[PDB]
Design a binder for this molecule. Sequence first.
Ligand code: CLA
Ligand code: KC2
Ligand SMILES: CC1=C(C#C/C(C)=C/C=C/C(C)=C/C=C/C=C(C)/C=C/C=C(\C)C#CC2=C(C)C[C@@H](O)CC2(C)C)C(C)(C)C[C@H](O)C1
Ligand SMILES: CC1=C(C#C/C(C)=C/C=C/C(C)=C/C=C/C=C(C)/C=C/C=C(\C)C#CC2=C(C)C[C@@H](O)CC2(C)C)C(C)(C)C[C@H](O)C1
Ligand SMILES: CC1=C(C#C/C(C)=C/C=C/C(C)=C/C=C/C=C(C)/C=C/C=C(C)/C=C/C2=C(C)CCCC2(C)C)C(C)(C)C[C@H](O)C1
Ligand SMILES: CC1=CCCC(C)(C)[C@H]1/C=C/C(C)=C/C=C/C(C)=C/C=C/C=C(C)/C=C/C=C(C)/C=C/C1=C(C)CCCC1(C)C
Ligand SMILES: CC1=CCCC(C)(C)[C@H]1/C=C/C(C)=C/C=C/C(C)=C/C=C/C=C(C)/C=C/C=C(C)/C=C/C1=C(C)CCCC1(C)C
Lengths: 150, 99, 171, 168, 78, 128
Amino acid sequence: QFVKPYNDDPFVGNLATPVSTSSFTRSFLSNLPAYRSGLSPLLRGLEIGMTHGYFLVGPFYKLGPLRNSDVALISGLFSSIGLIIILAACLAIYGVVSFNEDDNTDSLQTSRGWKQFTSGWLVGSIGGASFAYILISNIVFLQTSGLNLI
Amino acid sequence: FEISDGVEFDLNPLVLAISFLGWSLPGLLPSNIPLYGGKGLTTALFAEIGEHLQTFPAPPPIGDPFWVILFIWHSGLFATMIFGTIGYNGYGPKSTTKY
Amino acid sequence: MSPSIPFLKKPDALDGTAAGDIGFDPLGFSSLADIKFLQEAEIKHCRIAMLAAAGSIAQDIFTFPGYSALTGGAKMTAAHDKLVATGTMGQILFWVSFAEVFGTVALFDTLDGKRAPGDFKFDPLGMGKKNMADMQLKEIKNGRLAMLGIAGMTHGYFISGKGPLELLGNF
Amino acid sequence: QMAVPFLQPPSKLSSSMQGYAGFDPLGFSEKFDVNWLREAEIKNGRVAMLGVVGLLIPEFITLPMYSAGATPYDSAFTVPAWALIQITLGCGAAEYYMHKGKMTPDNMFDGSRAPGDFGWGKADPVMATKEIKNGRLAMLAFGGIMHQQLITKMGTFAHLVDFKPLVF
Amino acid sequence: VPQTAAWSAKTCSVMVISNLLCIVAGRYVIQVKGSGPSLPLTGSFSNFGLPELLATTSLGHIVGSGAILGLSYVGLLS
Amino acid sequence: LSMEGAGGKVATMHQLLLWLGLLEVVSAFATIQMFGGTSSRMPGEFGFDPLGFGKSEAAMKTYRLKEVKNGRLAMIGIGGMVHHYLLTGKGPLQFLGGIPNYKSCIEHPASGLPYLMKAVGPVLPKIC
Ligand code: CLA
Ligand code: KC2
Ligand SMILES: CC1=C(C#C/C(C)=C/C=C/C(C)=C/C=C/C=C(C)/C=C/C=C(\C)C#CC2=C(C)C[C@@H](O)CC2(C)C)C(C)(C)C[C@H](O)C1
Ligand SMILES: CC1=C(C#C/C(C)=C/C=C/C(C)=C/C=C/C=C(C)/C=C/C=C(\C)C#CC2=C(C)C[C@@H](O)CC2(C)C)C(C)(C)C[C@H](O)C1
Ligand SMILES: CC1=C(C#C/C(C)=C/C=C/C(C)=C/C=C/C=C(C)/C=C/C=C(C)/C=C/C2=C(C)CCCC2(C)C)C(C)(C)C[C@H](O)C1
Ligand SMILES: CC1=CCCC(C)(C)[C@H]1/C=C/C(C)=C/C=C/C(C)=C/C=C/C=C(C)/C=C/C=C(C)/C=C/C1=C(C)CCCC1(C)C
Ligand SMILES: CC1=CCCC(C)(C)[C@H]1/C=C/C(C)=C/C=C/C(C)=C/C=C/C=C(C)/C=C/C=C(C)/C=C/C1=C(C)CCCC1(C)C
C-alpha cells in the first residue's frame, strides 16, 4: 500500500516510499535552494554557502588546537576560511572537468551555471562564517553554549 | 497529505489526543515506591517537570527519578500512539484492508 | 493584499469568510494545520481565556465564603495551588475532561466537515438568533482581547504579586 | 429532540425503544448489537435498583444469622463468603432458567424476544419507560450510595443526618 | 514478603468465580472446537466439550491464583 | 544594556528590539514575496500613508526622490555624528559648537566594541 514502484515504473532502480516520495519530502526537497524554482545558480550557491560556513566556525572554534586560547574564535574563523577556499577549489575543478562548454542556459549543470554556483558558494560561505564569528564574539551565550546561565 | 507517491493519509490529531489519554489516565495509578513518590506516572512526570523548571538551567542530576519516569512514560506513550494509529487507520471507519 | 498587513499578501488558506478573518497569518500556521482545527482551537482558547480573565477580576473583587478560609489569602495561581490539595481543582479538572470527551466527538464531526467549528448549539436564551455574524465576531474579538488580558494579568501577578485590580489601585 | 444537539443523531436507536432520548454521543449502538446493549441496560438497571434497596434496608434491619459491619457495603466483607458465592450460583441458575439456556448474544434474542422480556408480565410502553428511567437513576444512585458508604464509613441515613465531607 | 492468606471462603469464592468467568469467556472466545461429543448441556452451552471445559478450568485456575495472590498483596482478600 | 541583565530592572533596548523584530520578520516575508515576484509590493512600500501625502503618483514620485535623498544625507550624517562622538565625547550640537574640538574633548565610556579603536593610538595619531 505505502511502498510502490517509482513513477509507476516497476523496472527503474528505485522504489516509491514515504521517505522518498511523501508530500512533506517532496515539498522540502523542492523548496531547498538546490531545487527551488527561479533561483539562479549564483543564488543557490549564495544560500547554500551562507548556511554552511555558519556551522563550520563552531567545530573549529570549540575543538580546534587553539580552543583554550584567547584567539580561539579568530583561529576558528580562519580555519573555516581555509576549508571554504579548499572546497571552492574542489567545486571549480569539478565544474571545469565535468561540464563542457556547451550552453544549456544556466541550469546548474552547465559550465557557466556551475561557475556561478561556485562563485556564489564561496561568497556566501565566507559571509556566513564572518556572520557567525561576529555573533559568537558578541554574544556570551554562544561562547559558553549556555553555561553563562548556570 | 500523501504518505507516499499517491497514497493519502489522514493524519488526524485526535488519534494523538486519544492515545495520549489512553496512556496517561492509567498512569495516574499511584504507587508508594520512592520513584513515583506517592503519585502516579503522569503526575510524577508533571511534578518533576515543575521541580526542575524551578531550577531551570541546571539539568536533573543523574539518579534523579526524572529520567526514569520520562523514559517509562514516553515508552508507553509511543506504544499507545502506534497502537492508536493502527486502530484508527486499519480498524477504523474508512479502512479498506481487513486486518 | 492582506487587510491587517497592507504590504503582505493575503494568506492563501484564509478565505476571509470566517469571523475575525482579517488576513493575519504572517508565519503561515494555516498551511501547517487544517483551518477548521485551528478555528476550533482559537474559539476554545477564546472562551477559556474569557472565563479566566473574568475570574481573575471577580476573585479580586469578591471571594466565595469558605474558599477564603481554604485558600488562606492566596491569589491567582497561588489559589490554584492551595486548592489542588483540597481537590477543588480536581473536581474542575474531572468535569472539564468529561465535557471535553464530547468535545472530542464534536471535533471528529468538525474535521469530517459535518459541524461548524466552535458550534455546540448552546444558545439557551437565544441571544444569537438575530445577528449570528455580529455575535460570532464579538465572540472572537472579545476572546482575543481576553486571551491577551489574562496573559497580562498573570504576568503582572508574576512581577508584582498583586492582583489585576490591586495593581491598578497601587503599583 | 436529541440529548446532544451538536452531534450526529444515533441512527440505530429509535423512539420505539424504551427511554429513547437520542443519547449515544460515543456511538456504542453503532459498534455493538443494540439488542445486547438494551438487554444489558435493563439487567444492570434492575440489579442496581435492587442494590440500592439492599444498601439502604440493611442499615435498619440485620438478619439474625448475620453480623453487620460499619456500613451495609462493608457487611459484604463481614458476612461469610460462602453466602456470596452461593448468591452467585443462585443467580447463575436463575439466568440459565430465565434465558432457557440462551445466554449468548448469538442466541439470546432468538424467537423474536424483546430485550429485557422474561415473560414475567405483559409489556406496556409507559411502564417500560418508567422501568428504564428508574433503572438508570438507580444505577447512578447505587454508585453514589456505595461510594458514600465506602468513604464516609457511615450508613447513608446517618450520613444524611450528619453530612460530613467525603475525603481521601 | 507479600502476604498469602490461608484457605478461606473468600479464596474459594475467588477461585470459583474465576473458573466460571473463564468458562463463559471460553464459550465466547474459543474459535475452533475439537471433534467429539459435548457435555450434556443445551442452549449456549450446547457444544461445550470436555477439552474446552478443561482448558477453561485451567485458565480459571491461573486467573484465580493470580487474583488471590494479588488481592492478598494489596491486602483486600486478606 | 548594562542595566538590562538577568538580575536587571530595565528592559529598554530589549523591548525596542522585540517590537522592531516583529516588524522586521513581517517585512522579511514581504521582501521575500517582492523578490520572488509573487507580490506587487514595491521596495519600501509598507502601506503607511495616514495623511495621504503621496496618493498622487507624481506626488509619490517627488516624495520618493525626496525621501531617498534625505535618507542618503542622513546615512552620511549619522555616521559622522557617531564617529565624532567616539572621538570627542560630544553630541552633534556640542561638536558643532566647539571647532578645535580636540581641545575641549569630553570623556566618553568605552564603545562596547573596544577592539575597533585598537589602531587609534599605536598606528594612528591620538590628538585629544
Ligand atoms: C484483581 C486481581 C489482581 C490483582 C489485585 C493483582 C495484583 C498484582 N499482581 Mg497480578 N495477576 C492477576 C490478577 C491480579 N493481580 C491475574 C488474573 C493474573 C494471571 C495472569 C496475574 C498474574 C500476575 C503475575 C504473574 C504477577 C502478578 C503480580 C502482581 C502484583 C505486582 C505487580 C506489579 O506491580 O508489577 C509491576 C511491574 C512492572 C511495572 C515491571 C514489569 C516488567 C517485567 C519484569 C518485564 C516485562 C518486559 C517485557 C518482556 C517487554 C515489554 C513489552 C515490549 C513489547 C515493549 C500486584 C499486587 C506480580 C507479583 O506478585 O509480584 C510480586 C507478578 O509477578 N500478577
Ligand atoms: C441465591 C440464593 C441461594 C440459594 C438458591 C441457595 C440454595 C441452597 C440449597 C439448594 C439446593 C441448599 C441445599 C443450600 C444449603 C445451604 N446454604 Mg444456601 N442458597 C442461597 C443463598 C445462601 C446464603 C446467602 C447462605 C446459604 C447458606 C447455606 C448453608 C450453610 C449453612 C451453615 O451455616 O452451615 C447451607 C447448608 C449459608 C452459608 O453458607 O453460611 C455459611 C448462607 O449464608 N445459602 N442452599
Ligand atoms: C454562551 C451563552 C451565554 C454565555 C455566556 C457567558 C458566561 C459569557 C461570558 C463572557 C466573558 C466572561 C467574557 C469576558 C471577556 C473578558 C475580557 C475581554 C477581558 C479583558 C481584559 C483586559 C483587556 C485586561 C486587562 C488587564 C491587564 C492585561 C493587566 C491588569 O493589570 C489590568 C487589566 C485588568 C486592565 C449565556 C449563558 C448568556 C447564554 C447564551 O444563550 C449564550
Ligand atoms: C512617512 C509618513 C510620515 C512621516 C514621518 C516621519 C516621522 C518622517 C521623519 C523624517 C526624518 C526624521 C528625517 C530626518 C532627516 C535627517 C537628516 C537628513 C539628517 C542629516 C544630518 C546631517 C547631514 C548631519 C550632520 C552633522 C554631522 C555629520 C555631525 C554633527 O556634529 C553636525 C551635523 C549635524 C552637521 C508622516 C507623519 C508625514 C505621515 C505620512 O502619511 C507617512
Ligand atoms: C550604537 C553602537 C555603536 C554604534 C553605531 C553606529 C550607529 C554606527 C554608525 C556608523 C556609520 C553610520 C558609519 C558611516 C560611515 C560612512 C562613511 C564612511 C561614508 C563615506 C562616504 C563617502 C566616502 C562618499 C563619497 C561620495 C560618493 C560616494 C560619490 C561622490 C560624492 C562623494 C562625496 C565623493 C557602536 C559602534 C559605537 C558600538 C556600541 O556598542 C553600540
Ligand atoms: C532536522 C532537525 C531535527 C531536530 C530539530 C532540528 C531543529 C535540530 C532540525 C535540524 C536543524 C538544522 C540542521 C539546522 C541548522 C541550521 C543552519 C546550519 C543554519 C544556518 C544559517 C546561516 C545564517 C543565518 C547565515 C548568515 C549569513 C549572513 C547574514 C551573511 C552575510 C554576508 C554575505 C552572505 C556575503 C557578504 C558578507 C555578509 C554581508 C556578511
Ligand atoms: C464490594 C464487592 C463485593 C462483591 C462483588 C465485588 C467484589 C465486585 C464488589 C462490588 C463492587 C461494586 C458493586 C461496584 C460498583 C461500582 C459502581 C456502581 C460505581 C459507579 C460509578 C458511577 C459513576 C462513575 C458515575 C458517573 C456519571 C456521570 C459522570 C454522569 C454524567 C452525566 C450524564 C451521563 C448525563 C446527564 C448529565 C450528567 C449527570 C453530567
